[PDB]
Amino acid sequence: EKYQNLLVVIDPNQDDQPALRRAVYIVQRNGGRIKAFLPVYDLSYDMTTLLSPDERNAMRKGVINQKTAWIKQQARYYLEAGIQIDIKVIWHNRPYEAIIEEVITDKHDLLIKMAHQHDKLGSLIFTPLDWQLLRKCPAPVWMVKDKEWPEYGTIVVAANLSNEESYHDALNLKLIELTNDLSHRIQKDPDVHLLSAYPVAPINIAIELPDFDPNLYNNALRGQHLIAMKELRQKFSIPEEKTHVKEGLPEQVIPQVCEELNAGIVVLGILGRTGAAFLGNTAEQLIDHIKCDLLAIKPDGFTCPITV
Amino acid sequence: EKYQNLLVVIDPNQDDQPALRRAVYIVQRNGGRIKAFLPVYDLSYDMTTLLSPDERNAMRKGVINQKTAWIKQQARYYLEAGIQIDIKVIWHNRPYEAIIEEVITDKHDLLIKMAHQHDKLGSLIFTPLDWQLLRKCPAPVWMVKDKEWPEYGTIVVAANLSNEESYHDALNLKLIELTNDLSHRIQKDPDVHLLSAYPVAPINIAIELPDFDPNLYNNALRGQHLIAMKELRQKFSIPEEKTHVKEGLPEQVIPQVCEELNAGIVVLGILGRTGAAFLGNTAEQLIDHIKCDLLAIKPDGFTCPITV
Ligand SMILES: CCCCCCCCCCC[C@@H](O)CC(=O)O[C@H]1[C@H](O)[C@@H](CO)O[C@H](OP(=O)(O)OP(=O)(O)OC[C@H]2O[C@@H](n3ccc(=O)[nH]c3=O)[C@H](O)[C@@H]2O)[C@@H]1NC(C)=O
Ligand SMILES: CCCCCCCCCCC[C@@H](O)CC(=O)O[C@H]1[C@H](O)[C@@H](CO)O[C@H](OP(=O)(O)OP(=O)(O)OC[C@H]2O[C@@H](n3ccc(=O)[nH]c3=O)[C@H](O)[C@@H]2O)[C@@H]1NC(C)=O
Numbered sequence A, B: 001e002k003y004q005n006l007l008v009v010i011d012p013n014q015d016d017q018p019a020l021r022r023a024v025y026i027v028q029r030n031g032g033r034i035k036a037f038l039p040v041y042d043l044s045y046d047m048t049t050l051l052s053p054d055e056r057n058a059m060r061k062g063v064i065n066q067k068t069a070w071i072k073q074q075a076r077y078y079l080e081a082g083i084q085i086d087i088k089v090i091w092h093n094r095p096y097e098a099i100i101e102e103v104i105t106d107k108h109d110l111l112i113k114m115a116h117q118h119d120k121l122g123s124l125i126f127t128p129l130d131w132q133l134l135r136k137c138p139a140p141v142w143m144v145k146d147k148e149w150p151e152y153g154t155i156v157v158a159a160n161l162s163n164e165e166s167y168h169d170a171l172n173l174k175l176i177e178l179t180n181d182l183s184h185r186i187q188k189d190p191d192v193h194l195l196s197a198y199p200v201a202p203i204n205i206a207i208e209l210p211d212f213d214p215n216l217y218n219n220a221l222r223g224q225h226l227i228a229m230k231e232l233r234q235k236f237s238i239p240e241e242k243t244h245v246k247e248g249l250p251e252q253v254i255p256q257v258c259e260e261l262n263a264g265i266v267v268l269g270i271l272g273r274t275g276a277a278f279l280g281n282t283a284e285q286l287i288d289h290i291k292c293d294l295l296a297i298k299p300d301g302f303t304c305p306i307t308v
């Protein structure tokens, strides 16, 4: 019994809740319970001269009442089927803060939230709230695209096999251990692949360094990837045919290869550490171009900027 | 001579630079100069065991050399025509920080940056870098959509006539003074409109307050808007026919009315103050649904989280 305590971030701008549906799918297969969470507010609450505290509180209670019933209406078939869904609507004017406090306080295992994709060939659309959650939520964040899961969809883990700091390796292990555990709890025959991407040197020759050959750097970075990739696949019983080390800009390559592999989801490590500033740069461009679900996972060391 | 010192944020992912084009259009009409700015980096720089400092610095200089020449190639017709364009490429792995430091240090009057719009009926697409700039840049931020400016396009100032704090009024004045000054420097006959939106109470009746009528609150908020709107239009010589006070959620109404008025641009006040937390909430949803250019302006009081 793991991943039993799921947090769904309800989207207030439409009725249907793909994040709720995904959570139900999970709980039907692995047990557990779901919190359907929505932070709400209203301009009237800030009109403190025009309205009295009692007037503003009447409006506040009205909004909570209405939104709670609206969520229940969306959840009603799931509820009747016996799925444990706790609806939680609270008064809060800074949604990302509200959501992350809920994660910390109730030790949620996964946060699930929908993201829109407009066209078949299109990238997921991320709001500023989505970005805040990706940057700051300490629990894994599952961005569910609002489209059908592809039949025979694969699960792609994007490892960082380039950067030299030891925390990358620990995070790569965490990604794959979690992907293997969770996928097997949900699917009868999960199809897990491992993927890395490395860019090449931006020069042909160095004016000050006559014996330097940048091609040898490209080959070394590739060889570093191949050794690390073999070690990962052996540790986690992934066949060599399902490992992929690819040359090019990661923010271009990883989305492209995910589409070539018919990925239902990409699993990605993201940090909080500030400086590896270029890693958050690459990561944000990569995410911003993904065309499938995203599962973003932080390292064990993560310190959330938000505290309760 | 004002608005003479323009900062263009170059987009590294395509050749054509709508932000540069817009800046040129401005300078041809109002004089001045342009800084075409791009912060660049490369993974090799962080590979400090695999590569030596000299090797990494060779790659660094190569990237700066190449990107500087690439910008010049895009700017070449403008340059030949006599437009003053200073190209500045620097090594930095956190673009939003680099850009804002440039604004602070050289006291740029305007930051201009392109945003994509995919369909005719579509919202502007904002990257995480765009959001960082909107949230944190102390100078006005002009997001230029990558589509033709509409013929006879209007200029719409979205005022906050709801919130009770006095800083809103000062910021409304700043928006209109700037819009009138800059538009007249650029266009021979600018078509400026003023727009406000207010939402209604979320209840019909209050259980604890038998004499309260929420409809009277809706009418009062409207009347507050009408008085403030008249004062603004008289101060800034805008005809009553070009003022619009509209009922509904601002993040829905303002984008919709901008389209109804054939806006080329919406001008919007945004803050840094943290708590008016609901204002940044509304503002982010509004921005995220705009279908025309955006000019985002901070108050005089603004304290930038970034310092040099
Ligand atoms: C390491 C991480 C990787 C692990 C691997 C993860 C693999 C995930 C694979 C996901 C597969 C995906 O297809 C699951 C899925 O969504 O299947 C639905 C199916 O695509 C649909 C159409 O064929 O049929 C079902 O969806 P429906 O929307 O038709 O039914 P429902 O059971 O979801 O909803 C019950 C009723 O409640 C209603 N409802 C539901 C949600 C809501 O917000 N509002 C609402 O009214 C809904 O309209 C419906 O009438 C199916 N619903 C469920 C829960 O299985
Ligand atoms: C309170 C705030 C509100 C104030 C009101 C603001 C109002 C703003 C109104 C803007 C109107 C808008 O139409 C201006 C505009 O973009 O007009 C272009 C016109 O839409 C185009 C097609 O009819 O013709 C022109 O654009 P081109 O791209 O054809 O010529 P150019 O002068 O911009 O470029 C010169 C050459 O350099 C080349 N170039 C330019 C940029 C670049 O990044 N790369 C490049 O190669 C380009 O391809 C071209 O061959 C016109 N270029 C200029 C500078 O006027």
Ligand SMILES: [Cl-]
Residues within 6 Å of the ligand: A186, A187, A188, A189
């Ligand atoms: Cl299955």
Ligand SMILES: [Cl-]
Residues within 6 Å of the ligand: B186, B187, B188, B189
């Ligand atoms: Cl004109």
